[PDB]
């Protein structure tokens, strides 16, 4: 159900997506938009998440769409995050999609960058957090 | 599975109150519970690679973490609200990751995670439980 963002901006985005190349983006979302410390990203909540049979979403499934979209706001091949700081104001119900918005704090100069992720359902926002993301030069396991 | 036996209070599902219906191939087990108390495993799965080197996206030892910490309170509807997660170390493909949670409506949850003999995470994280399920306030 993309009728969040053309079928352009997205293949536009994974042309240019350089992190978790590899991530599974029905469990984490889908990144929808990417510039200079900045990214969007969109999690549709699927039966593949859900805590019971009420159609309760588990909460770390934000916390995975929203550990994406801060490492899209940076783009860096070899990154990986190290902390964070999350606020869950209201979980999800399955059928809901979350849309994401990640700004990177200026800094052209450290590998490690603090990223402010906030979520929302329609008009309520459900989520908002802090997260840490640190970059290398190389692969981490080499 | 050498981590805990097939019935060695691994039977703790006949206990668990909390996330039913939870993916726990993403989410690890829970191998032991008391009150206040929970202890699980997460054996990472090629499901969860960021990339094709073998790394482990974050967001799966938090959800093993997110997991654990509600176990440990073992209420029937419970939600968490807030968390402050470090990640000391990233998870490798094949590696167990073996967790433990203390709880000390509103709870805070320790939690902490180790592969082999090394901490890789710790975390705090925050449990509300309601009479009713949420969804119905």
Redesign the interface.
């Known amino acids: 159900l993309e009728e969040y963002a053309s079928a352009e901006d997205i293949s536009r985005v994974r042309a240019e997506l350089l ?6 983006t029905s ?2 979302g889908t990144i929808i938009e990417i510039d200079k410390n900045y990214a969007k990203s969109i999690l549709i909540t699927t039966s ?9 979403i ?4 934000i ?2 769409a929203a ?2 979209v801060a490492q899209a706001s940076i783009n860096k091949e070899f990154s ?12 999800l ?1 399955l059928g809901d999609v979350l849309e994401l918005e990640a700004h990177a704090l200026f800094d052209e100069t450290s590998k490690k960058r603090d990223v402010k992720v906030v979520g929302h359902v329609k008009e309520i926002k459900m989520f908002e957090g802090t997260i840490q993301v640190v970059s290398t030069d190389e ?3 080499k």
């Open positions: 992190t978790c190349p590899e991530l599974n469990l984490a593949e998440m859900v805590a019971d049979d009420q159609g309760l588990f909460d770390a499934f916390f995975a550990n994406y990986v995050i190290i902390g964070s700081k999350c606020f869950f104001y209201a979980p119900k692969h981490i396991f």
